[PDB]
Each structure stands twice: as structure tokens, then as C-alpha cells.
Amino acid sequence: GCDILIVYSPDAEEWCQYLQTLFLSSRQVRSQKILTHRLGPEASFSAEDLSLFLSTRCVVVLLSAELVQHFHKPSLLPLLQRAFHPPHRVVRLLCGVRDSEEFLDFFPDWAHWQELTCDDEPETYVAAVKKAIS
């Protein structure tokens, strides 16, 4: 590991615990190292942390309102571009944020991520991180 990294902000806390339990329940990914990193506003990342961002095999981005606010911090954005790459390794879950063309200004390969919604079947969630680590 790290194999699967769930990046989220505190407003999407429960979505994060939901996916953890689902991923640990499922045969395709239960066996993998599944870590989480909560973004803001209490902190930036520790040495051992920003490591994980760059080192993980697959990233799952919980797209909440509080999370995209971090896309607007220029000290931080360049790290996120290098972390959320390459696009076939990135999954986003829309958490009360409508998808948009503006995101292409922050992440140029945005359109090539795997996208999930709040009303997707659980099998869809797991198939996406299965496809992303494989």
C-alpha cells in the first residue's frame, strides 16, 4: 500500500465512512490497503501524509463543497494536480456538487475521471475502484 486513498472534507465525512465499510466488505478490494485523508481546515499535511497523496495507486475524490474550496488555494492546487493523476487512476464521487466545465481549469484531464453519484448502486462504486487499481 497505499492502494486506495479516499480524499474528503469533513462535510462528506459519512460518505467516507460508508465507502470504507463497503470497500472492506467487498471481495475485489477488501484485501487492499485503504487509507483516508481528511482535507482542512485544521491542517495541512504531515511528512507521512503528503507522501500518501503521491504514492497511492488509486485516488477516490469525494467532491463536496468544502473540498472544492481547497481547489482555490494556490499553495495547494499544484499538489492536487500531481496527486490526481493519471486520469484512469482517479475516481470522483459527486457529493452535493453538480459536475461542471469550470473544473477543467483546475484539472485538465477532469473529463477522463471515472465519475460516481450518490444514487449509484454499491456494485457500481466497487467496480469503479476495482477498474482503477487494475
Residue numbers in the entry: 6 to 139
What does the paper say about this structure?
One such adaptor, B-cell adaptor for phosphoinositide 3-kinase (BCAP),4 functions in linking the B-cell receptor (BCR) and the co-receptor CD19 to the activation of PI3K via interaction with the SH2 domains on the regulatory p85 subunit. Architecturally, BCAP contains well defined ankyrin repeats and a Dof/BANK/BCAP (DBB) domain; the latter was first reported in the Drosophila protein Dof, where it is required for FGF-dependent signaling, and a homologous domain exists in the B-cell scaffold with ankyrin repeat (BANK) protein. A recent study predicted the existence of a TIR domain in the N-terminal region of BCAPL that is required for negative regulation of inflammatory signaling by TLRs. Here we present the structure of the N-terminal domain of BCAP, firmly establishing it as a TIR domain.
The N-terminal domain of BCAP comprising residues 7–142 was solubly expressed in Escherichia coli. The structure was solved at 2.5 Å using data derived from protein crystals in which the lysine residues were dimethylated and single-wavelength anomalous dispersion phasing with 5-amino-2,4,6-triiodoisophthalic acid monohydrate. There was a single molecule in the asymmetric unit, and the structure reveals that the N-terminal region adopts a typical TIR domain fold. The TIR domain of BCAP is composed of five parallel β-strands (βA–βE) surrounded by five α-helices(αA–αE). The third α-helix has a kink and forms two helices, αC and αC′, and the fourth is distorted. The loop regions, with the exception of the biologically important BB-loop, which connects the βB-strand to the αB-helix, were well defined in the electron density, and unlike the structure of the MAL-TIR domain, there are no disulfide bonds. Strikingly, the orientation of the βB-sheet and the αB-helix of BCAP TIR domain is such that it extends out of the domain core in comparison with that of MAL/TIRAP. The electrostatic potential of the solvent-accessible surface of BCAP reveals distinct regions of negative and positive potential in addition to hydrophobic patches, suggesting that the TIR domain of BCAP may interact with diverse TIR domain-containing proteins. The isolated TIR domain of BCAP is monomeric both in the crystal and in solution, a feature shared with most non-plant TIR domains, suggesting that vertebrate TIR domain-containing proteins require other domains to promote self-oligomerization: leucine-rich repeats (LRRs) for the TLR, a death domain for MyD88, and the DBB domain and likely the ANK repeats for BCAP.
